[PDB]
Design a protein around this ligand. Structure first.
Ligand SMILES: [Zn+2]
Ligand SMILES: [Zn+2]
Length: 218
């Protein structure tokens, strides 16, 4: 797997396969992941980053490297690590897709609002790249969604899903610990053959990360 950093070393992208890279940025010293989809109609991100600066840097980095424009982003919940760069997106005319609940929660947290255009299950298509978004229920937050690439059997778990190295659930101020297991099970039931899982924070793994998150919920 290839890994490209930015000049400061605050941002990395690292390849999962041909058209699918993870993005990782550091904010205040805490890492955060999303996806970069290289499609024939432009670059699509799953999630932005912690703030406007890092989001700008992210976009600059992937636009140069893949030689096409970021056209769309999928926002997976309304916390800073996911939605922090929303102003950069809107001012560039980058479409910020989300559920209606994530948009409200964005506004309530005082962020500019994403589109609120995703339903519980939405099937999108960008160039040849298929993408499903799924709301499995409450967990890390009320609104948290996952993203599924059916052509690659790749799941972006976001902050719903913990990495192997995580010993606890992290910040549960906005969580629903009792719904979180059922929500993970809903993911397991929909996506019965998974090649890789991208957690919101920490290293990429397989379905074990969902089972691991279950254990941490006990
Ligand atoms: Zn969060
Ligand atoms: Zn997070």
């Amino acid at each position: 797997k290839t890994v490209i950093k930015n000049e400061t070393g605050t941002i990395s992208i690292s390849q999962l396969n041909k058209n699918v890279w993870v993005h990782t940025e550091l904010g205040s010293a805490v890492p955060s992941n999303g996806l970069v989809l290289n499609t024939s109609k432009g670059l699509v991100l799953v999630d932005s980053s912690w703030d406007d600066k890092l989001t700008k840097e992210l976009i600059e980095m992937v636009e140069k490297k893949f030689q096409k424009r970021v056209t769309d982003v999928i926002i997976t919940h309304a916390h800073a690590d996911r939605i922090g760069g929303i102003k950069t997106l809107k001012e560039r005319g980058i479409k910020a897709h989300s559920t209606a609940l994530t948009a409200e929660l964005a506004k309530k947290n005082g962020y500019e609002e994403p589109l609120g255009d995703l339903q519980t299950v939405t099937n999108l298509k960008f160039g040849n790249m298929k993408v499903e978004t799924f709301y499995p229920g409450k967990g890390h937050t009320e609104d948290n969604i996952v993203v599924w690439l059916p052509q690659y059997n790749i799941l972006v778990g976001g902050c719903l899903v913990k990495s192997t190295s995580a010993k606890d659930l992290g910040n549960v101020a906005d969580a629903y610990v009792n719904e979180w297991s059922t929500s993970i099970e809903n993911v397991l039931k929909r996506y019965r053959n998974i090649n890789a899982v991208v957690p919101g924070h920490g290293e990429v793994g397989d379905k074990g990360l969902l089972l691991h998150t279950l254990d941490l919920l006990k």
